Structure 1
Amino acid sequence: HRDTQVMRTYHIQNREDYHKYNRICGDIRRLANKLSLLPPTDPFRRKHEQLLLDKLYAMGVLTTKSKISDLENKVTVSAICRRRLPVIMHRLKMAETIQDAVKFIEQGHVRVGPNLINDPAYLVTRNMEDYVTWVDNSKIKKTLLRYRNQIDDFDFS
């Protein structure tokens, strides 16, 4: 029951979410394997996984882009399941717990740039990880500003 055991730690909608990642996280390694079977001094192969580690680090599933061994060993579903939006709202200390962040996404208090986001299971790029905020004029961004005694209703915060 590894699929359930990580559905709890990150709070997932459907128990099938895990194996929806673990099909991708396996598909990384199958492309890693056949790209390991090409000869090492091939300017395709040298170009092609560094082309891929650019993307898998921008998305942020893997910690570094130097170690080439991470691509088979550290690519786990729990790695890709913590660039989920409610985990990121718990990493950035927005909500208190990780269930409570799903409660705030589903009610509609969080946003990415212009548009608010409503699927809890929004993957967030490490580049896009800068831009999550509380949605403006919300009743939960109004309460935060009352704690510091710094509301400003010309913003109608």
Structure 2
Amino acid sequence: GDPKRQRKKYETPSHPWIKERLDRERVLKRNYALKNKKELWRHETQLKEFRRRARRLLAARGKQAEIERQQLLQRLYRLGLLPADAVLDDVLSLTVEDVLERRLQTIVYRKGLARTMKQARQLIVHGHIEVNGQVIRSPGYLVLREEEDTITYAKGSPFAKEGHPERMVIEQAK
């Protein structure tokens, strides 16, 4: 036979030039300061996988189905998309905006460590941000629920200084 090659983790659209879809995606890209459509598409794909799993597992019989239900709910809880008293139908009410909320760039903007999303991106990429003690330079990391309150400036980093000029400008917004 043939061996398997590595495959993409995102899916492209069925028709390229549909106006409603173009408008929606233009708004999202602009507002979350994304570089391409690949990123939006890969987050959409994450959500679609969660939904397909829930659809398959809903009204199924056996031991493994129960195990996998509990695993799915625990994972969504741990990622910060559902609460604990969540049932499996609550997975079908999720949107891509939740998954876009859960990325570093967005959280760094929402805490006040940056004035804008593009500034947040540059901070991350240049190495000025730490999570749970560890520098992470990927603006699509998908922060976990128990890592959020540990996000700060990196120890060795100019912005660690209470008197840096750009940090003064940043704090002036809050």
Give the shorter-chain TM-score range: 0.7 to 0.9
- Secondary structure of the residue aligned to 2:72 is helix
1:77 to 58, 79, 96: 96
Normalised to the residue count of structure 1, the TM-score between the two structures is 0.78
2:53 to 4, 8, 31: 31
- Secondary structure of the residue aligned to 1:119 is coil
C-alpha separation between the residues in 2 aligned to 1:54 and 1:94? 30
Equivalent residue for 1:151? none
2:36 to 7, 10, 14: 14
Equivalent residue for 2:168? none
Q: 1:99-132: per-residue Cα shift (whole Å, max 9, x none)? A: 2211211222111234311122221111121321
Q: Percent identity?
A: 29
Normalised to the residue count of structure 2, the TM-score between the two structures is 0.71
Equivalent residue for 1:128? 147
Q: What's the CA shift for 1:43? A: 4.7
Q: 1:69-101: per-residue Cα shift (whole Å, max 9, x none)? A: 320112x22111111101111222211222221
Q: 1:8-58: per-residue Cα shift (whole Å, max 9, x none)? A: 22222222111111112111111111111315xx55434432221111111
- Secondary structure of the residue aligned to 1:87 is helix
Q: Which runs of 5+ in 1 are unaligned?
A: 148-157
Alignment coverage as a number of residue pairs: 141
1:74-153 to 2 correspondences below 5 Å: 74=94, 76-142=95-161, 145-146=162-163
Whether the aligned pair in 2 keeps the contact of 1:3 and 1:19 (CA below 8 Å) is no
Whether the aligned pair in 2 keeps the contact of 1:105 and 1:118 (CA below 8 Å) is yes
AA aligned to 1:58 is R
Equivalent residue for 1:48? 68
C-alpha separation between the residues in 1 aligned to 2:71 and 2:58? 14
Aligned Cα RMSD in Å?
Answer: 2.0
C-alpha separation between the residues in 1 aligned to 2:127 and 2:114? 13
Whether the aligned pair in 1 keeps the contact of 2:76 and 2:82 (CA below 8 Å) is no
